Design a protein around this ligand. Structure first.
Ligand SMILES: COC(=O)N[C@H](C(=O)N[C@@H](Cc1ccccc1)C[C@H](O)[C@H](Cc1ccccc1)NC(=O)O[C@H]1CO[C@H]2OCC[C@H]21)C(C)(C)C
Lengths: 99, 99
């Protein structure tokens, strides 16, 4: 679909079999989801944005369905204020910016 | 034009008589630019990213040209690591997400 930006570009995602709302974020290198339980091994990591760094758990090769499009890639889980879908997964679903 | 998300969507902007590189950020409500001495009145504001909040200066009705497309709105100035074009200006240039 084509999504305008008058409102936050929020979509429903499915991850670990659970539905959630997330922000399609061209300004995020990585995908960062609020605290949740996910199956599989994980490594501690840290990521920075505006305001400083947060500590996250990095899950690799996680299945996630974004607005009906499947992706398999790295998902960071931590105390992010909003679920954000970053470029590592936006590229997989074929998302582009257009004007 | 169309912009893929393999790399950060960095483009040239023109503001206050200067050329800069900035990030087209669908995950940003607001536009935040690296420290610069714009003329005119401003008001203090605080904006939050994933790591917390920073102090910025809010300038209103500022013209920014983004890839030849003009937009006029509120521009925040403060200690951000990257020039960020947010939805308040991306809407004015007819920018959409497409997949
Ligand atoms: C309403 O609040 C807002 O709109 N705040 C805006 C904001 O911060 N939005 C966040 C999400 C958010 C956070 C908090 C509340 C609501 C939404 C997403 C945004 O695109 C940032 C931009 C950014 C790129 C590079 C370095 C620092 C920042 N990207 C990011 O933090 O990405 C992370 C993840 O991936 C990594 O790559 C880049 C840095 C890493 C802003 C106006 C301050 C800019």
């Amino acid at each position: 679909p084509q999504i305008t930006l008058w409102k936050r570009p929020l979509v429903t995602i499915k991850i670990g079999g659970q539905l959630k709302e997330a922000l399609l974020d061209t300004g995020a290198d990585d995908t960062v989801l609020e605290e949740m339980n996910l199956p599989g091994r994980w490594k501690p990591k840290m990521i920075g944005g505006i305001g400083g760094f947060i500590k996250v758990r990095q899950y690799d090769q996680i299945l996630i369905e974004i607005c009906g499009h499947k992706a398999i890639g790295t998902v960071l889980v931590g105390p992010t204020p909003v679920n954000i879908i970053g470029r590592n997964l936006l590229t997989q679903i074929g998302c582009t910016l257009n004007f």
